[PDB]
Design a protein around this nucleic acid. Structure first.
Ligand SMILES: [Mg+2]
Ligand SMILES: [Mg+2]
Ligand SMILES: [Mg+2]
Ligand SMILES: [Mg+2]
Ligand SMILES: [Mg+2]
Ligand SMILES: [Mg+2]
Ligand SMILES: [Mg+2]
Ligand SMILES: [Mg+2]
Ligand SMILES: [Mg+2]
Ligand SMILES: [Mg+2]
Ligand SMILES: [Mg+2]
Ligand SMILES: [Mg+2]
Ligand SMILES: [Mg+2]
Ligand SMILES: [Mg+2]
Lengths: 145, 261, 63, 178
RNA sequence: CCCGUCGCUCCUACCGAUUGAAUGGUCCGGUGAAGUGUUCGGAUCGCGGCGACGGACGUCGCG
RNA sequence: CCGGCAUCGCGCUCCUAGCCCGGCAUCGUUACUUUGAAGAAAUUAGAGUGCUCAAAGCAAGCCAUCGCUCUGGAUACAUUAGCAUGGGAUAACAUCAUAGGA
RNA sequence: UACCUGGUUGAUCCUGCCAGUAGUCAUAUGCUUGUCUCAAAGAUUAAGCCAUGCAUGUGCAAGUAUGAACCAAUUUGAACUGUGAAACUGCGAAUGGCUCAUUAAAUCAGUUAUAGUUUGUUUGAUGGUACGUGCUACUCGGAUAACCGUAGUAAUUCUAGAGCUAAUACGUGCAACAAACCCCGACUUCUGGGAGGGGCGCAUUUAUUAGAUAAAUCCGAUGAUUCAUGAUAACUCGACGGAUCGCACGGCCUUCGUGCCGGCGACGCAUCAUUCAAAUUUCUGCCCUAUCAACUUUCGAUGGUAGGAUAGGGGCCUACCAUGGUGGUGACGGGUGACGGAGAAUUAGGGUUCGAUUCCGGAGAGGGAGCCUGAGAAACGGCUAC
């Protein structure tokens, strides 16, 4: 459909689509149903991920990646990549001699599941996963515009 | 390094072994076993250091090659064997039996027990789950794996294990209201009673404990080890009944004990 | 090489001002009256005293 | 030799990265197997970390293929590779990798479907109540072969295993083979 | 009291025609030892079938 | 010095839940501060102890200094970052006039 | 000890530096040197070069002793007995020791993660089917050292050929059911049935399927999983599933036959868990320099899909596609007479400077590069090449 735009047919692992005795209430990812999961740590699975048609191996809610480690919160800084954003963390670093502060920042790449929509400069909550690319080790879980 | 390390330099040895810093360049380096080598007490220290049954390295070996020392029911001739918390060390030749328990200062002590209370130990369960062919089995925190447990025993609980029959004989359900002896951190040695448990999704669970003499403290789940059901514990306590005290309390203890002498 | 781990320390300290008559005479008074062999014996007593006084002052600062 | 460390890479800033180390053996890679599809089967063992073994298959001829909706898996032959989504030159070289598209003799499947006295017919008749067998599979059968996808790593486990395409997947690869 | 030019003695640095000189690295182009993987190869070495043939022989059994 | 209430204290099914009753959890975030956990030893500070003193060391001391007794081998500091707990003055950043409010 | 003093003037009060004054677990050098305890010592320049010697080998009752021995010595079946050298087999040599050249978000420290992996060994638990047409196990190989003997070469733990002989070396090779369930399926009666009888340990790989609510007979785990785990269909030219070794004896006959047994141990195979660890990995933190403002990107620079490779995640690498990524909050470059930390010196407080060196982590073995063995090495008291 809209997802099948690449040189190979993209599908979720371990869901048998051409099932014989199908159903609408067995379990997520059983009898042909699209698979989804709840990440945990008090986050809620977006409805657009639940009844979604996108296929994303790296999505927190429908893909194979697990969220574990740190939970950082920041603001979106760049959304000009395919399914990946750069977020800014702004923080205060203490300068001990002068007993004062200075403003520092860090750029964190994070994978953005198609179930979200991000402008530039939205509040994002990202959670850590296994390395997904050279620089990405975090996944977007919440977006507040 | 291109492989495993086999020496333990004396300054890097655990602080609760109380090894003196000029007594050589190396420390015994506990061999792999049922305890994590930073929370164990090798046989070299049990014989040579604490019990003063031997004066040198080689005397400990002369003791062990003769099959006197028995650890938890089997004879262990390895010299750096990692004996640990709640193990039993038995010398039948002298007919003497010790349970390894903590003292309030965080150091292992050999508490003498009777022969009745040496055929059993307690052990905390690491987890329970299925194995090959659907068989359920539980993990302890000292290596033992038991198959076909009571289907109620869940993780973090305690079990009594007879050394003779090697199976379970009773268990304690980890929960609020039981006595627990702390096995890590600064509070190791202190017994107490579980008063509160607060969960935190994605981090360590923390336990809030209250001593019998009123002092209140806290630790994390991994460092708590239940001893008994209810306020009564199932096993003997050492010279102090697991009650921490301030430095001023023991200063008073020394000076008050200095008037009768 | 163990035995490198044995501690050792300094017990005295020389005066900041080498030649001042007042301190010179005050120190010689003690070196004579108590039959000490040299100034170092007086200075190590002073250094031990200064240690115990710093400890006392710190404890007095607290509540 | 071939290596899997990040040292030769440039930093994310694009700054060059100085060499502070030599290459470590726990970082190695090996050259690929590019398993050809040919009769003279050859699978050659590899000693890998931990003392374990991987089976590098250099040349395979038969395979194990599952037909999902019918819940049967049978050994068969591989006749050709027709489409590879990574590189066409792999197709031109008849190289087997995971997710390649292959044609399969399908006769063992046909003979299973030939199956499915009195009690025997009172079971053929129990079945055939749910016979669907969408025409897309039927046409391929009359052709003699089935389109299949490899679901194993021949250069890793030394085998060519897979499934027959069905439904959305089958029709997608059909329109791509056009 | 004091300024500068010029002359003498010592010192320090600067520019500099001279494709000045030496030296190490880097990039691109080429040549490329040796190892590792692979394709052939096959000295000889193994049931040395067999014809039931007279230690040989070759058809060999595959390694 | 503080708990526990009451004035004109936005709620609870679910955990703790007194004999109809305090003290319940998500529908703004931080800095700051308080307390705790987890923090290698050696070094530093520091408790004990007459190596003859000291620099040290981690010992030793009593027994009738007779078939062994009592033992010790504390405690603390650890900026910044990370985890958790109470406070909500001070100061940030986000924001009730489209009522799309409860 | 929260401290100052000499010096610009004819004299004054200042600014301001110079000089003094003290320390250094700080190096050298000079003069001197009686006792006791203590203990740094080719780091700095040359991570420059090395004669010679030594630094890693190893035996239990428990792998293999007529190859030649010592010591018993046999009554001359039966032992090479008791004790062994040598040699095969196994294991270890990947730890320790030394140094600080390279290395400035690198290493490293605190703090995370593996639901992203490997792990000889220790410890606990565990283990049927090998073919028999699953109807209780189905047979024993050759060849090599120590030795013996003929040599080569100037030469070396350089080497060729011949005669012997072992195994826990090497190579074959018996297999424990109800088959529990699953698919076939001659006939029976009509099936919802009965069914005679052929194909189904543990690993490998793939696929399908199960793995349970919500208040008016659901039943393991996590913060979170298509999880643990079970069933099913197949696959593989399967690493595997004991042809081994020590003493001890000691009940009882079925041929009274080392007779039926039966123990305590050693070593070894495979799986899980544990322990001993490693590898990757999250957040924050590092000196001077702008007379270093743009850098990276064709040739991987940032991301996406599918693969290949790896123990495993990942542009790690390949193909295709998108145009990103870092930067005055200092990127990129340059200097470092820069390994990081614990720590050191001086310290009223705040600070300043140092940290080659015995503990932790990293890195290297003349410079690069490539490897074999192995659980573990990109090893150098291992190899190959320059
Ligand atoms: Mg080393
Ligand atoms: Mg050891
Ligand atoms: Mg001052
Ligand atoms: Mg003047
Ligand atoms: Mg004058
Ligand atoms: Mg000066
Ligand atoms: Mg990619
Ligand atoms: Mg991938
Ligand atoms: Mg350097
Ligand atoms: Mg140097
Ligand atoms: Mg070191
Ligand atoms: Mg090295
Ligand atoms: Mg050299
Ligand atoms: Mg090397």
């Amino acid at each position: 459909m809209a997802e099948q735009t690449e040189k190979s047919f993209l599908k979720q692992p371990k869901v048998f689509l051409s099932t014989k005795k199908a159903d609408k209430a067995k379990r997520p990812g059983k009898a042909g149903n699209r698979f989804w999961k709840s990440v945990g740590l008090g986050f809620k699975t977006p409805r657009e991920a639940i009844d979604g048609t996108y296929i994303d191996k790296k999505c927190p809610f429908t893909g194979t990646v697990a969220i574990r480690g740190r939970i950082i919160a920041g603001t979106c800084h760049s959304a000009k990549m395919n399914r990946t954003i750069i977020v800014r963390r702004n923080y205060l670093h203490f300068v001990k001699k002068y007993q004062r502060y200075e403003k520092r920042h860090s750029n964190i790449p994070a994978h953005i599941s198609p179930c979200f929509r991000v402008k530039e400069g939205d509040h994002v909550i990202i959670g850590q996963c296994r390395p997904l690319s050279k620089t990405v080790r975090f996944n977007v879980l919440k977006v507040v515009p | 390094a291109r492989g495993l390390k086999k020496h333990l330099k004396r300054l890097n040895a655990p602080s609760h072994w109380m090894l003196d810093k000029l007594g050589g360049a190396f420390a015994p380096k506990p061999s792999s076993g049922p305890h994590k080598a930073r929370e164990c007490l090798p046989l070299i220290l049990i014989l040579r250091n604490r019990l003063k049954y031997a004066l040198t390295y080689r005397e400990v070996q002369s003791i062990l090659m003769q099959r006197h020392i028995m650890v938890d029911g089997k004879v262990r001739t390895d010299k750096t064997y990692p004996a640990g918390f709640m193990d039993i060390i038995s010398i039948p030749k002298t007919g003497e039996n010790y349970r390894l328990l903590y003292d309030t200062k965080g150091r292992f002590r050999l508490h003498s027990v009777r022969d009745e209370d040496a055929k059993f130990k307690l052990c905390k369960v690491r987890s329970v789950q299925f194995g090959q062919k659907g068989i359920p089995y539980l993990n302890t925190y000292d290596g033992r794996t038991i198959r076909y447990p009571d289907p109620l025993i869940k993780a973090n609980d305690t079990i009594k294990l007879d050394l003779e029959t090697n199976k379970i004989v009773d268990f304690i359900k980890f929960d609020v209201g039981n006595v627990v002896m702390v096995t890590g951190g600064r509070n190791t040695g202190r017994v107490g009673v579980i008063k509160n448990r607060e969960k935190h999704k994605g981090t360590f669970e923390t336990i809030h404990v209250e001593d019998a003499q009123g002092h209140q403290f806290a630790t994390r789940l991994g460092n708590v080890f239940t001893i008994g059901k209810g306020t009564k514990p199932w096993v003997s306590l050492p010279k102090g009944k697991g009650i921490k005290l301030t430095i001023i309390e023991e200063q008073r203890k020394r000076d008050a004990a200095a008037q009768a002498a | 090489h163990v035995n490198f781990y044995r501690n050792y320390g300094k017990t005295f300290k020389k005066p900041r001002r080498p030649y001042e008559k007042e301190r010179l005479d005050a120190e010689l008074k003690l070196v004579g009256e108590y039959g000490l062999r040299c100034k170092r014996e007086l200075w190590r007593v002073q250094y031990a005293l200064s240690r115990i006084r710093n400890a006392a002052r710190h404890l007095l600062t607290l509540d | 030799g071939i290596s899997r460390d990040s040292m030769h890479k440039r930093r994310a800033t694009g700054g060059k990265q100085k060499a502070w180390r030599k290459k470590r053996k726990y970082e190695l890679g090996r050259q690929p197997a590019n398993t050809k599809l040919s009769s003279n089967k050859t699978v050659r063992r590899v000693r890998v970390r931990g003392g374990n073994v991987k089976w590098r298959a250099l040349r395979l001829d038969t395979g194990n293929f599952s037909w999902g909706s019918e819940a049967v898996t049978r050994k068969t032959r591989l006749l050709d590779v027709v489409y590879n989504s990574s590189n066409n030159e792999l197709v031109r070289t008849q190289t087997l990798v995971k997710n390649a598209i292959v044609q399969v003799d399908a006769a063992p499947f046909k003979q299973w479907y030939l199956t499915h006295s009195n009690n025997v017919q009172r079971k053929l008749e129990k079945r055939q109540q749910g016979r669907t067998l969408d025409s897309h599979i039927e046409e391929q059968f009359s052709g003699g072969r089935l389109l299949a996808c490899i679901s194993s790593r021949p250069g890793q486990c030394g085998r060519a295993d897979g499934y027959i395409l069905e439904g959305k997947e089958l029709e997608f690869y059909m329109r791509k083979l056009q």
